[PDB]
Design a protein around this nucleic acid. Sequence first.
RNA 1: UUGGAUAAGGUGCCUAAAUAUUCGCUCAUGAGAUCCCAUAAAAGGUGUUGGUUCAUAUGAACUAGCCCUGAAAAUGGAUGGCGCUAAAGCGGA
Lengths: 146, 51, 201, 180, 185
Amino acid sequence: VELTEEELYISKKNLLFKRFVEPGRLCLIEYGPYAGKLCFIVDIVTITRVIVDGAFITGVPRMVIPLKRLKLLKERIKINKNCKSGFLRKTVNSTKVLEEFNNSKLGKKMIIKKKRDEATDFERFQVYFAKRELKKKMTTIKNKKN
Amino acid sequence: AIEPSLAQLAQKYNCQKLICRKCYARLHPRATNCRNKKCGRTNQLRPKKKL
Amino acid sequence: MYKKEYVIDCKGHLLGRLASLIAKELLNGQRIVAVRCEDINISGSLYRNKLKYQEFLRLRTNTNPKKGPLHLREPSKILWRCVRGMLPHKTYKGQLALKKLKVCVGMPYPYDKKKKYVLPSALRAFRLKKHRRYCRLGTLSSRVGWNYDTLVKKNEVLRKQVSKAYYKKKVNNLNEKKEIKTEALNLINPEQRQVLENFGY
Amino acid sequence: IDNSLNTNIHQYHIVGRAIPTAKDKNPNVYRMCIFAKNDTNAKSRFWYFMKKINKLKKSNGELLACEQIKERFPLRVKNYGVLLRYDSRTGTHNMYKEFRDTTKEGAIAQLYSEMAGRHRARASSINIIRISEISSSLVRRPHIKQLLKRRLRFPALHLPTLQKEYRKKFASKRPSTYRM
Amino acid sequence: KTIVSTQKVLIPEGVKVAINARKVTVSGKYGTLRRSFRHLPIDIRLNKLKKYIKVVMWFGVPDSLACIRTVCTHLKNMFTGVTKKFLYKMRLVHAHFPINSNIVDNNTRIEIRNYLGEKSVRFVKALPGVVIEKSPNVKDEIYVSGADIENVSLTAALIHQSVLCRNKDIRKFLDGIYVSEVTTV
RNA sequence: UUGGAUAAGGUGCCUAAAUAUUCGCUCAUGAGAUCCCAUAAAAGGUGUUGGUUCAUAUGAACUAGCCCUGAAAAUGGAUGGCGCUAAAGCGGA
Ligand SMILES: [Mg+2]
Ligand SMILES: [Mg+2]
Ligand SMILES: [Mg+2]
Ligand SMILES: [Mg+2]
Ligand SMILES: [Mg+2]
């Protein structure tokens, strides 16, 4: 027996807690050898420990970690509780969740940071030059406005 | 001049209590433990002496 | 600690931890302006804290109390004392470090307009479980005869309006800048623009 | 691989027996699984247990084999029941505790912490008598029952354990514990 | 550590509720009550379309559960207050000297006089927003009333304290002013 | 003497090294805090944490962890100090 217009209400009820640790939360590892890495919560072991799995796109193998070490993201993918890594890989690729994450603010900023880190001196200089050019233009526009 | 119901009511507050055998605290008539820290919350409760 | 002078907004911080953080920095060699020290927190209940402070007060020097433990009871002064406790203040270096610390109640004549940093290692939000009793230092001080609490609060309130006003202007400026950038991304060169886009800006 | 996380309790199958004598040429062998931090420790534990149970001391027996048991499905959550004998400062007790974990070894690691923490029972004073996986129809302990619930979900109320790089003691903005 | 524990408090009909960050505010026929709960960790969530509000606690020992229940009870009380004022019916009992119970200052401040005959006045001001009426029906009693269950009760307690006699045998001297019936209107 | 790498011990600051990680326990209206060591007990506790044995999701009885009471002395005052409660406490890893 369907709802009709209560559906809308349910959709737009601001909950305090979104991002529940559950099967198929995206998860950004904060602490350890794996950090800045993404990885999905496959199972949950106990109130504090979770089994994570970067399905082989990401660097991180199936293993148990403390929930403390995780940073749950807005992204989810529906998966069967039992799901082994191959299946996870299949699903995530199909659903394009990683792309979505990248598009999202945090992911974007992460990738920008990575780019900055990996830059050559020249590339840094190029960016500086560009900024200078922009500043010039910007300054001119400000002057015009004033 | 204390009509019986009123008297009863009064008693309910002033008289039908338990008392800690240790620190003398006034307790509700149905209490098991003293509630006061200095006794170390004893189980040794007695009825408030009537008349 | 490579800046000239860190201003620390002491609101929401846990007294001792904050003090500890300050002390090391001071030792290293770093002026620190602990600002808004009325709002520092202590991890006990209020009553417990008061009791501790009462006990402290009680320890004067029997013989001649002009000397002996000075019971400085402005929150800032308390903070300062705490900081001192964690410094080798009987040396020269320690003394210097101590001197480097300035503490204030509310925020005054430069430290309104300086950036205010926060020590998140010593933040009450991150360091006490929410079912634990804490206590605002200012209140504690008041309880133990500081008096100038209400006045301070009033001053803070006054300052907040000013800050808000400033913030509006700042926001507007930011918006304008953004607009200009949007306009003037189109007017550069293509390749340069592309490069800029690639690295975030 | 993560070495900050590990607890290096392994399980060892030990088999040993009394040295044969002219009077008892074919003695009994005894085996056990033993939870120990390394192989030598395991051996020692085995010897101790032999001493306790049978007349058998390390000097008049011989270890036949020490195997090391690695968990077969080290990434499947299981519900482990354990039965301990421990010594308090006042006396000696049995207890049965349950741990949801990924391996026997992990469970035992948990257990040692718990006994240390909850009872001040140090590793010396404990003897694990049996650990066995309890299928969830027979789980008696409420803190394990809860986990076994159907479509389990919960928020992340833990605080960030930032890497020591990005732990900086001066912050621009008052961080937020809410997150989302 | 119980993963989730909940409670459901059914809002009545003519009540305008509005929680935010545990700062619950309820309005209705009698009074607008506001009463913060931002000392226990709890994501009290509102359902405005249906009735009811859900108090929910993630993790936490029995303490937390207890707190949750308390919160729920408080909410219920608040709702009741806004629908229908709480009416603490306080009967004053005297042996010899009748107690003069003079209400003043817009039915706040009740001056009690001639308690055990001492020719001295006991002032007992009511809390914010809590009327103190005297009897229409019977002779002796005193209605204390006004929305916030906490405040009316407190007022009543204060009144009682103002009376209660000092160094004598209190079993013999039953004189005072006691809460007979906690009710609504 | 130079360099190394340890011991006992430590690693919030004083104080060189962890506001490390990881799992518990503990809130104390005179917490606790590390061999000798600079004190605490019998007895209690519907404090909370596990258990054990019993009965019909409640009622019992126990049991031992931490905590509380028991716990009062004279200059002012000492886990060494500051302080610490998502510990910088207690027990582990
Ligand atoms: Mg007399
Ligand atoms: Mg050397
Ligand atoms: Mg070294
Ligand atoms: Mg150091
Ligand atoms: Mg230390």
